[PDB]
From a paper:
A key step in this process is the formation of a ternary complex where a heterobifunctional molecule induces proximity of an E3 ligase to a protein of interest (POI), thus facilitating ubiquitin transfer to the POI. Heterobifunctional degraders consist of two separate protein binding moieties (the warhead and the E3-ligand) joined by a linker. The ternary complexes of the bromodomain of SMARCA2 isoform 2 (iso2-SMARCA2BD) and the VHL/Elongin C/Elongin B (VCB) complex induced by different heterobifunctional degraders have been studied extensively. In particular, PROTAC 1, PROTAC 2, and ACBI1 are three degrader molecules that induce a ternary SMARCA2BD:VCB complex with quite different degradation efficiencies.
ACBI1 bridges the induced interface, forming contacts with both proteins. Importantly, the degrader induces favorable contacts across the non-native interface, such as VHL:R69 and SMARCA2BD:F1463. SMARCA2BD:N1464 maintains critical bivalent contacts to the aminopyridazine group of ACBI1, positioning the terminal phenol group for pi-stacking interactions with residues F1409 and Y1421. On the ligase side of the interface, the interactions between Y98 and ACBI1 are consistent with those between the same residue and PROTAC 1 or PROTAC 2. Despite differences in the linker compositions, the protein–protein interface induced by ACBI1 is structurally similar to that induced by PROTACs 1 or 218. A slight 1.7 Å twist of ACBI1 compared to the other two degraders, which can be ascribed to their minor differences (e.g. the ACBI1 linker has one additional ether group compared to the PROTAC 2 linker), results in a subtle swing of the protein in the crystal structure. However, the major protein–protein interface contacts are the same and the structural differences do not align with the markedly different degradation efficiencies obtained, suggesting that the corresponding (dynamic) ensembles of induced ternary complexes may be fairly different and therefore responsible for the degradation differential between PROTAC 1, PROTAC 2, and ACBI1. Many of the charged interface residues, that are solvent-exposed and outside the range of traditional hydrogen bonding or salt-bridge interactions (>6.3 Å) in the corresponding X-ray crystal structure (e.g. K1416, E1420, E1423 on SMARCA2BD and R60, R64 on VHL) are determined to be protected based on the HDX-MS results. The resultant MSMs predict that the crystal structure of the iso2-SMARCA2BD:PROTAC 1:VHL system is 2.2 kcal mol−1 higher than its global free energy minimum, while the crystal structure of the iso2-SMARCA2BD:ACBI1:VHL system is only 0.7 kcal mol−1 higher in energy than its ground state.
Residue numbers in the entry:
A (entry chain D): 1 to 104
B (entry chain A): 1376 to 1490
C (entry chain B): 60 to 208
D (entry chain C): 17 to 46, 57 to 112
Write the structure that this text describes.
Amino acid sequence: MDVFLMIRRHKTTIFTDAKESSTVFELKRIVEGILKRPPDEQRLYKDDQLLDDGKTLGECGFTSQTARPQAPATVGLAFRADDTFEALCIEPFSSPPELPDVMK
Amino acid sequence: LSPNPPKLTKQMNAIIDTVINYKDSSGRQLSEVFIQLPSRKELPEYYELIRKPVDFKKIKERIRNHKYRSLGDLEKDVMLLCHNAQTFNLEGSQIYEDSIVLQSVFKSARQKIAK
Amino acid sequence: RPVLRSVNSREPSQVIFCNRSPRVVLPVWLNFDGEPQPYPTLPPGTGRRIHSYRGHLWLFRDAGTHDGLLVNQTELFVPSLNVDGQPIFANITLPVYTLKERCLQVVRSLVKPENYRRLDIVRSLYEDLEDHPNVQKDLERLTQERIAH
Amino acid sequence: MYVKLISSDGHEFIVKREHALTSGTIKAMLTNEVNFREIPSHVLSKVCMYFTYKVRYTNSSTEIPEFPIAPEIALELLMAANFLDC
Ligand SMILES: Cc1ncsc1-c1ccc(CNC(=O)[C@@H]2C[C@@H](O)CN2C(=O)[C@@H](NC(=O)C2(F)CC2)C(C)(C)C)c(OCCOc2ccc(CN3CCN(c4cc(-c5ccccc5O)nnc4N)CC3)cc2)c1
Ligand code: NA
Ligand code: NA
Ligand code: NA
Ligand code: NA
């Protein structure tokens, strides 16, 4: 059944769902619908490892247990420009402040 | 209202003590909830239904004050307590099932202490 | 006699209370006058077959915080008569809290009430933190909903 | 179908319109881009996760899990939620 993702590149984050049984290529088609870049202009990653197009999201390690609506899994996205793929670059989010004394 | 003989009051008290002190196989005192009626303010519904309310406090008092003239008169008040609890809390309640076991413990205690 | 009360049906009804929340649950019975009564608590994942009566009104809270919970996707639970000795099942879950309410629950859980006004937050949120969830609040809301059939 | 939410540090969040409309504030401000000068990325991402959670579990029959909040984002997330009316 359903897996819940953040697809992240530079300072862009797409919130989407897909099926465990759906393929890395079908995820690139979801991205193409949103960011108008074709699959052959995309590399998707899990923790720095390149995802093959023919593999299922479940086969890549995206399960109902590791990719939840309230805690979605991260997919890295790198685009092609001038026939060269950029390095995968995900800008961190901001850091929270020091935990106040009254919250222990 | 003159005193019962000592041996009859000794019988009555030892029967009721057995019923009151009885614990089941889980280790729970079944009498606990039956010691004292709730008040007419706590639970008016009990008094709209039950014409002759009675608890183990009142039954121990009726022993002290020689109002029961036979082991038989004692049984009737205990069966009445158990039937009132059965009438109010219907079949399927723990308290209905508890009252059934206590009827049995009473008859069992009176069978031993009338020997 | 209030709108939200148990009726004195004297018609027995077997019910299964099942806690499918990660909270300790406090079952709450509304008596014949609408006054909520606390019943023994259910640890997470536990269930119990309990005796109730037709037309008896129930609701369910976090035993520690009085955060409101659902039963069969609504707030009130009322048994029918059992059909052919089948017990009625009451599935007790988390609702989907608003994010605001869920944030109040977490801050309340991490901060002693004296220290609420020592947090570096929009001041209107001090009142929200102190307005602790409770049965009487929700009872009045559910009553207003019923007034509009 | 999708709208862009921009945090104070310039992170863009592309979420389903239906999910964003969970926020009373967002629902009013809707065009399809929304700039938040005062909500930072570590808060806005968590808000987006709440949107996913809400649409998924609202009126479900499956068991509902707890929405988790780290102690360190709780105060900011409260103020976001209070401003966003969700
Ligand atoms: C284990 C568990 N984990 C999660 S939840 C739970 C659980 C669930 C149910 C239950 C039990 N079920 C209920 O309480 C049901 C739920 C609701 O439907 C109301 N309800 C009744 O039973 C009511 N009854 C009715 O409407 C009738 F009976 C048909 C008319 C009523 C409350 C009015 C009783 C449970 O049990 C734990 C303990 O719960 C209690 C403990 C003490 C009290 C306070 N009072 C009550 C009166 N009471 C009595 C004394 C005598 C008596 C004394 C002396 C001589 C003679 C006598 O007859 N008789 N009857 C009494 N009822 C003494 C105690 C209430 C509840 C746990
Ligand atoms: Na009685
Ligand atoms: Na009743
Ligand atoms: Na019953
Ligand atoms: Na929730």
